[PDB]
Amino acid sequence: SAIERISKAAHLIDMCDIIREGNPSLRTVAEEVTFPLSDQEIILGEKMMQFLKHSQDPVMAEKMGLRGGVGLAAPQLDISKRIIAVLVPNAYDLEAIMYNPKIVSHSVQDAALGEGEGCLSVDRNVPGYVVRHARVTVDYFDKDGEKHRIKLKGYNSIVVQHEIDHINGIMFYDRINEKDPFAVKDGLLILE
Ligand SMILES: O=CN(O)CCOc1cccc(C(=O)c2ccccc2)c1
Numbered sequence: 001s002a003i004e005r006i007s008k009a010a011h012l013i014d015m016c017d018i019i020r021e022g023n024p025s026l027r028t029v030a031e032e033v034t035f036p037l038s039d040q041e042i043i044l045g046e047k048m049m050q051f052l053k054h055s056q057d058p059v060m061a062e063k064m065g066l067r068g069g070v071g072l073a074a075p076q077l078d079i080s081k082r083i084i085a086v087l088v089p090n091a092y093d094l095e096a097i098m099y100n101p102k103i104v105s106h107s108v109q110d111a112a113l114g115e116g117e118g119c120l121s122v123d124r125n126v127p128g129y130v131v132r133h134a135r136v137t138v139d140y141f142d143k144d145g146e147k148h149r150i151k152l153k154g155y156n157s158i159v160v161q162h163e164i165d166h167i168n169g170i171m172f173y174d175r176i177n178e179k180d181p182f183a184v185k186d187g188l189l190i191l192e
């Protein structure tokens with residue numbers, strides 16, 4: 001069991017735990033977690049966040065051969081559960097382990113990072129503007145089953161949507177304009 005070996009106290013998540021394109025799991029819709037959470041589900045969220053911090057540490061990332069990341073979703077670890085971790089640097093602009101996250105409202109205005117996007121499960125560069133909602137209101141539960149409702153914009157908004165896409169089986173390039181990858185449509189805000 002992926003969640004079983006990953007949640008072992010001694011286990012450190014690394015690139016070898018992250019599945020890549022082709023693996024059906026990344027295109028499957030993740031199952032919601034029930035409350036109360038099991039100890040493994042709590043530990044998993046903590047392991048995921050630990051990985052993000054390790055991936056953002058020069059020495060640590062080097063040692064473990066880690067790709068820098070600002071977010072991670074359980075499906076990427078071959079665990080089909082609606083659990084995601086986000087860690088956006090400013091200490092941190094956003095630090096959160098989210099259970100059953102859901103977008104409950106979104107702006108009509110769209111947004112896209114001017115540099116495009118990349119994915120830990122994608123070993124290649126896919127240029128283009130990843131079209132997302134500029135702003136989103138997200139509901140999620142923390143490890144204690146406490147509900148949170150937050151509003152995100154700018155970079156944080158993009159990052160959370162990218163991870164939520166993973167628990168719904170969507171990849172970043174699925175939102176890039178096939179015709180013109182760098183086309184600027186009315187209402188699209190380019191971030192940079
Ligand atoms: O699912 C998780 N991953 O694949 C890890 C990466 O997650 C994310 C989430 C949102 C954006 C990106 C980027 O590619 C990026 C673009 C410009 C500036 C900074 C970041 C990566």
Ligand code: NI
Pocket residue numbers: 118119120121162166
């Ligand atoms: Ni990704």
